[PDB]
């Protein structure tokens, strides 16, 4: 039973996520409700039970690596599924963090971006494509300086063939999706990481309209180092084959000498 195993609190944050505590060990959790009528892609568990694809993807990435949110449990109800998700405390998502702080110092953006890269690599290694990388979908564990990727509700199994469907965030989507309604998983992910990196070092995303997305011009509204500008422009290459691999991103000169998560918390979050 769900009502007997968790103490349910107030809403957090058209989504339905509640604060919670696991009665067993007083662990803080987030309790996410998903209506069956609104589920786009369905999947099957090893037991063959029909579950939301979100549950499938969350189970595939769940492990000791704390760069991705951990699905602690889930329940099925007549008209909905309920997901028990990890809740760090204290926490703030990266969108609110950038709103309150403005453009991030490059040392801090480097640490955050590096941790997002490791988390996305973990997803891909587990066969999972997130498809909605953005600052809203990144939680900051403020005391540990660790970032957590959340909300796989738009994700898919990773494949090497073309995708013709998309339900992530349009202003983070690549120009090949805007123009042709097709994309490949990894190069589309890299485009969204370019949007995210610009967002971190300039204080907001670069493109709001389709014509900006396909236009291929990146104006920098903030002082940004030449090295970081190069990485961003590389990630935002119009031709997908021109974009860097994850290895090329992490080997880029701007990415060297990253701070550890604990150093990040003490220098920038405490």
């Amino acid at each position: 039973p769900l009502e007997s195993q968790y103490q349910v609190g107030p809403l957090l944050g058209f989504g339905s996520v509640y604060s919670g505590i696991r009665v067993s060990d007083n662990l803080p959790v987030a309790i996410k409700h998903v209506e069956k009528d609104r589920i786009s892609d369905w999947g099957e568990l090893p037991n063959g039970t029909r579950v939301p694809m979100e549950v499938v993807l969350l189970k595939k990435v769940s492990s000791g690596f704390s760069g991705v949110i951990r699905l602690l449990d889930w329940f099925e109800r007549p008209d909905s599924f309920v997901l028990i998700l990890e809740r760090p405390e204290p926490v703030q998502d990266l969108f609110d963090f950038i709103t309150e702080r403005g453009a991030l110092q490059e040392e801090l953006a480097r640490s955050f971006f590096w941790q997002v890269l490791e988390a996305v690599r973990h997803c891909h290694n587990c066969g999972v494509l997130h498809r909605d990388i953005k600052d809203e979908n990144i939680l900051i564990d403020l005391n540990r300086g660790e970032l957590k990727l959340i909300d796989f509700g738009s994700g898919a199994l990773l494949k090497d063939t073309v995708y013709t469907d998309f339900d992530g965030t349009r202003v983070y989507s690549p120009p090949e999706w805007i123009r042709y309604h097709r994309y490949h998983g990894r190069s589309a992910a890299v485009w969204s990481l370019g949007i995210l990196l610009y967002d971190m070092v300039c204080g907001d995303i670069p493109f709001e309209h389709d014509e900006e997305i396909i236009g291929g011009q990146v104006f920098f509204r903030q002082r940004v180092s030449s090295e970081c500008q190069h990485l961003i422009r590389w990630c935002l290459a119009l031709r997908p084959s021109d974009r860097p691999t994850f290895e090329e991103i992490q080997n880029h000169p701007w990415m060297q000498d990253v701070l550890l998560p604990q150093e990040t918390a003490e220098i920038h979050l405490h």
């Binding site: 058209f14 969108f95 953005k134 809203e136 509700g153 965030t169 349009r170 204080g203 907001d204």
Partner: peptide, 8 residues
């Protein structure tokens, strides 16, 4: 300049 969230 207005900064905003963008639903999926």
């Amino acid at each position: 300049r207005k900064r905003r969230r963008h639903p999926s």
